[PDB]
From a paper:
The Spike (S) glycoprotein of coronaviruses mediates viral entry by binding host receptor and fusing viral and cellular membranes. [name]-[name]-2 [name] contains 22 N-glycosylation sites and 17 O-glycosylation sites. Cryo-EM structures of the bat RaTG13 and pangolin PCoV_GX coronavirus S trimers showed that, besides protein–protein interactions, one RBD is also contacted by N-glycans linked to three asparagine residues of the neighboring S protomer (N165 and N234 in the NTD and [name] in the RBD). However, the [name] glycosylation is lost in the [name]-[name]-2 [name] due to the threonine-to-alanine mutation at position 372.
Here, we constructed wild-type (WT) [name]-[name]-2 pseudovirus and its mutant bearing the [name] mutation to restore the [name] glycosylation. The [name] mutant pseudovirus displayed about a 50-fold decrease in viral entry into HeLa cells expressing human ACE2 (hACE2) compared to WT. The [name]-[name]-2 S protein bearing [name] mutation displayed a 5-fold decrease in ACE2 binding compared to WT (262 nM vs 51 nM), whereas the same mutation had nearly no effect on the binding of RBD to ACE2, suggesting that [name] mutation had more impact on ACE2 binding in the context of trimeric S protein than RBD. After introducing the [name] mutation, the percentage of the closed S trimers was increased to 84% (348,420 particles), and the percentage of the open S trimers was reduced to 14% (55,181 particles). Two atomic models of the [name]-[name]-2 S [name] trimers were built with one in the closed state at 3.1 Å resolution and the other one in the open state at 3.9 Å resolution. In the closed S trimer, all three RBDs are in the “down” conformation, and the open trimer has one RBD in the “up” conformation. Structural alignment of the S monomers containing “down” RBD from two different S trimers revealed the root mean square deviation (r.m.s.d.) of 2.50 Å for all aligned Cα atoms. The S2 subunit is more structurally conserved with an r.m.s.d. of 0.48 Å than the S1 subunit with an r.m.s.d. of 3.86 Å. When the S1 subunits containing “down” RBD from two different S trimers were superimposed, the NTD, RBD and SD1 in the closed S trimer all moved inward to the three-fold axis compared to the open S trimer, and the shift distances of the NTD, RBD and SD1 are around 9 Å, 4 Å and 3 Å, respectively. In the open trimer, NAG370 does not contact the RBD in the “up” conformation.
Numbering used by the authors:
A (entry chain A): 723 to 827, 849 to 940, 944 to 1058
B (entry chain C): 963 to 1146
C (entry chain B): 963 to 1010
D (entry chain C): 50 to 70, 76 to 121, 126 to 145
E (entry chain C): 290 to 341, 343 to 367, 370 to 480, 489 to 617, 641 to 676, 689 to 722
Write the structure that this text describes.
Amino acid sequence: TTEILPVSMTKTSVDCTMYICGDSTECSNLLLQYGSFCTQLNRALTGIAVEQDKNTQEVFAQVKQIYKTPPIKDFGGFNFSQILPDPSKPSKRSFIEDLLFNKVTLICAQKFNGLTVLPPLLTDEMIAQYTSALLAGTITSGWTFGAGAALQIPFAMQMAYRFNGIGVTQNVLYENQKLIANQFNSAIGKIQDSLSSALGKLQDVVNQNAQALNTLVKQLSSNFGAISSVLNDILSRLDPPEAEVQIDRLITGRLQSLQTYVTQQLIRAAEIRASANLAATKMSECVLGQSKRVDFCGKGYHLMSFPQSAPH
Amino acid sequence: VKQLSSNFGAISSVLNDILSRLDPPEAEVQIDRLITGRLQSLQTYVTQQLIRAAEIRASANLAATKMSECVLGQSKRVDFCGKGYHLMSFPQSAPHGVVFLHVTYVPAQEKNFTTAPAICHDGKAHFPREGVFVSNGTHWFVTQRNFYEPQIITTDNTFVSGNCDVVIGIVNNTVYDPLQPELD
Amino acid sequence: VKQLSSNFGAISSVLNDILSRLDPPEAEVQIDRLITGRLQSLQTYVTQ
Amino acid sequence: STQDLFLPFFSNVTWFHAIHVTKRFDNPVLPFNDGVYFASTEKSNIIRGWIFGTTLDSKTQSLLIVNVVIKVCEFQFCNDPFLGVYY
Amino acid sequence: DCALDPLSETKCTLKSFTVEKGIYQTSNFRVQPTESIVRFPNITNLCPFGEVNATRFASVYAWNRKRISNCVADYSVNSTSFSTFKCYGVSPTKLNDLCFTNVYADSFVIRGDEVRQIAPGQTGKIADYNYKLPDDFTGCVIAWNSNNLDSKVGGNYNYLYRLFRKSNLKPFERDISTEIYQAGSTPCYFPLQSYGFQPTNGVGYQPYRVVVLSFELLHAPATVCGPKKSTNLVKNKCVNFNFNGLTGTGVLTESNKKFLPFQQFGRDIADTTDAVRDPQTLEILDITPCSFGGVSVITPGTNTSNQVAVLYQDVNCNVFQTRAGCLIGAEHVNNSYECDIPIGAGICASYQTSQSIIAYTMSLGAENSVAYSNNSIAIPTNFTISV
Ligand SMILES: *[C@@H]1O[C@H](CO)[C@@H](O)[C@H](O)[C@H]1NC(C)=O
Ligand SMILES: *[C@@H]1O[C@H](CO)[C@@H](O)[C@H](O)[C@H]1NC(C)=O
Ligand SMILES: *[C@@H]1O[C@H](CO)[C@@H](O)[C@H](O)[C@H]1NC(C)=O
Ligand SMILES: *[C@@H]1O[C@H](CO)[C@@H](O)[C@H](O)[C@H]1NC(C)=O
Ligand SMILES: *[C@@H]1O[C@H](CO)[C@@H](O)[C@H](O)[C@H]1NC(C)=O
Ligand SMILES: *[C@@H]1O[C@H](CO)[C@@H](O)[C@H](O)[C@H]1NC(C)=O
Ligand SMILES: *[C@@H]1O[C@H](CO)[C@@H](O)[C@H](O)[C@H]1NC(C)=O
Ligand SMILES: *[C@@H]1O[C@H](CO)[C@@H](O)[C@H](O)[C@H]1NC(C)=O
Ligand SMILES: *[C@@H]1O[C@H](CO)[C@@H](O)[C@H](O)[C@H]1NC(C)=O
Ligand SMILES: *[C@@H]1O[C@H](CO)[C@@H](O)[C@H](O)[C@H]1NC(C)=O
Ligand SMILES: *[C@@H]1O[C@H](CO)[C@@H](O)[C@H](O)[C@H]1NC(C)=O
Ligand SMILES: *[C@@H]1O[C@H](CO)[C@@H](O)[C@H](O)[C@H]1NC(C)=O
């Protein structure tokens, strides 16, 4: 059975004087009577972005080594061909990772009002490389590599050990090895099929962020009780001795919109941080070893887990 | 503190300056703009404080759980009370926080060795009670999982599960028995 | 609910009293003050 | 931090000479843009006059500063004003 | 200093003199527009105003309404002496910079004792029964006294007004209906009544020939463009522009959109310019503004050195181009290590072998392989206690 967890949102950025004001000077001066405000805003957004980087860095970096799959696939009949990466692929992402990546899916105009977007520190290739290293370490060493140096061990013997940790004596596995391998392979087939046709937890994040950014962009089209929602128009139509009040009303409105957006972004960042902490603990307890906590590494008695990457 | 000196669109940043240099019937506007600006700045500060306090509450509850499951007892949660196997813990105080000392057992030096699931003695399949079979090339031995402490496969170090055929990788070795030597 | 009796710099905390005593083209300013403060109250609430 | 008039570091400033002992004498009419900086290496108090204004043609109120009579009048200057003591 | 060098920028932003290794922020790059294209249709006509104290107007009850179209304006300049000149919603002294829309000059005469009665939000008999101004008005009120003509020797008896009207007046509507108004019950006062124009009394008794010059801006394809001639047309640069009064800034490229001949411009999602029709070439164009960019500065720690490599985030370009953007002042190497100063998209700068700043793709750690077999196991023999 699978479990789906967001780990990071998209790193956003905004520049006030480019957003509230723009190709103007008197607007910049009138805003300068607050400037600590927008320093706070840019500081908070920078903090959120670097926090997202640290968050992914924390979840996916558990191994101080990089482990490679041995070329011989003699794992006692378990077919791991689906989850190990395939070199023949153009990219270095395995079959189920790619099938996940496909199920989840304007930019310029948003870029043209200060809303620049930053890229993640780790590229998807690097993330898939971490997941592949974790898979190879788990398969080839059991759980010791999470608490020391990786130690070789036959996979059948490791599975017998993981049985020994729930109350089922080894002879059960050593007698039903073929049956267990068949059930495992059939289960992997079923899961790849059931995902081959959901992932709401990974798409609500993107949709929420897109909707918030769109709402900001829409905000510039309102008057906030001025004569026109265009600073250039009001400047070309009206004189400095009187346009200042309408301009100031426009700053007040747009600044309010930025403030609300930053507050909601902070709250959602805290939520994602909590979710990623949960994901990190699930990683360190389920992947890097067997856990006896009920309903914390699956649904039932737990044996082992394999992590797969995803978009965000 | 810095937010006080800013004008917020009013002509000056001191209420005394406003009330002196201007008539209240025409200075109420400056007063009101300054009041609104300072209120909204205070609102932003309070919201920042609330979010920071929420984060600190999360960290504090994590620290409490770490104390109750690392200090007041050993924990089996891999990598929750250190990096390695956990033995015991030591808390220390700190300014606005706590600092822990996790005492983690870690094995360093390992050999090779060639292994097999079971032992075929007399047509009986012998499986280790709690240990693992290793081979020293010359013989087979049962040892504990984390230390090479090799011992003789006796009948109390193993248990039987029927015939040798079903298991794959079962090797043919003798199993020593105490009773027969003692009988005479 | 108690952030309805506030004036927000306006003369009447009731829109009825604003409209029945003041002309639309000189009452937008009173409406503007009232609406700004009521929106601010909503913003504080939803954040909490 | 401040927001005022300052000399940008490593400024390409002008250097004037008055060396006669060779036959160099020119202290031209320097316009006063906002802020002027003055570093002087002297031995004998060589600089003597400081005239400031816009036209200085007895057609506007003009400033007269020297090393201390400071008269704001409407002065009619000549083509090249200089001073001089005799030995 | 705060802005002479990137180091100065960092020190001024952080308010410190020893800057630690990392990446820090400063202002953002802006591409300044090189020139400004001026576009305007070739409008030769000049609007008539000497006819609009020429000889005679109408009164306020039936006020002279006139249209203006396809001509140029000029307020510096055939005319009449002017006591007052006032323009609501728009600067009176900035008018010739625009291309107006639907210009209407509202002409009549009115007594000097009621000059102040005409404004957007006035009340009283005049502004309620004879004329009416909307409350969102946009136009100019131009007034000047006329006693040369409209105050006769025996007094003027050519102009009339309505005293009291059963119904109010719609904004911009004329009242030309004369009837005995029923003041009480018992169905039947005459409305139209002569004024008191005589040059024998105070100036308020005099008529004031007042023209209300209302107008619109940028509502429909406009042809009331002011006296500014167009300029030539340049493309593919960050430029300024203007069209029929509109202003702006960006880069003008080719277009691919079809339009209908009753519109002017194209708006995007954020309600701002997306495409434009030239007023002379009558062709379609696209707008892509040039204001973009993010600036980042890298230092190895002021304690060590002072050579710094500036990063530009969304700028196409030791000038190295990256997914993170335009990086200037870094020696790109193939040799991969752990991250030292994180950049973005898997790049990290570092101060290594004088020595300089190198940018590279990070490493993920040492790469090894587990000697997996189905008949081998590694058993530890020693421990380490790690606190
Ligand atoms: C795993 O199953 C796939 C599905 O076709 C098959 O192609 C592959 O040969 C199998 N691998 C092993 C090791 O049997
Ligand atoms: C011991 O030798 C075997 C066979 O070459 C090998 O598989 C195993 O990795 C070696 N173990 C160690 C860690 O020395
Ligand atoms: C057992 O193996 C170790 C390590 O290879 C070796 O040093 C030792 O001599 C071996 N002993 C026997 C009984 O072969
Ligand atoms: C491992 O697999 C090979 C090939 O199937 C077999 O020869 C060998 O006996 C197996 N070893 C063990 C102990 O599982
Ligand atoms: C053990 O003995 C049985 C019966 O002779 C034989 O089938 C099996 O292959 C032997 N196994 C080994 C590991 O020698
Ligand atoms: C400005 O500075 C440069 C420094 O190389 C120098 O060569 C030049 O003569 C200076 N003068 C000017 C042109 O301002
Ligand atoms: C105005 O003059 C320009 C340049 O000769 C010409 O291209 C344009 O067609 C003329 N007419 C209009 C539509 O303004
Ligand atoms: C008409 O124009 C002339 C000069 O162009 C000026 O002297 C005169 O005052 C204007 N006439 C009127 C009646 O305003
Ligand atoms: C950093 O500063 C310390 C003194 O505070 C000094 O001892 C050390 O050499 C410095 N290292 C460098 C040059 O970065
Ligand atoms: C701009 O981008 C293209 C992408 O193919 C690149 O080849 C070119 O070097 C870049 N530089 C510029 C400014 O032309
Ligand atoms: C390596 O660095 C050089 C610049 O030193 C660059 O030209 C080249 O494209 C990079 N890639 C490789 C792997 O050659
Ligand atoms: C194990 O490592 C420790 C390091 O403190 C060392 O003192 C000890 O002698 C080593 N023991 C063996 C079995 O080599």
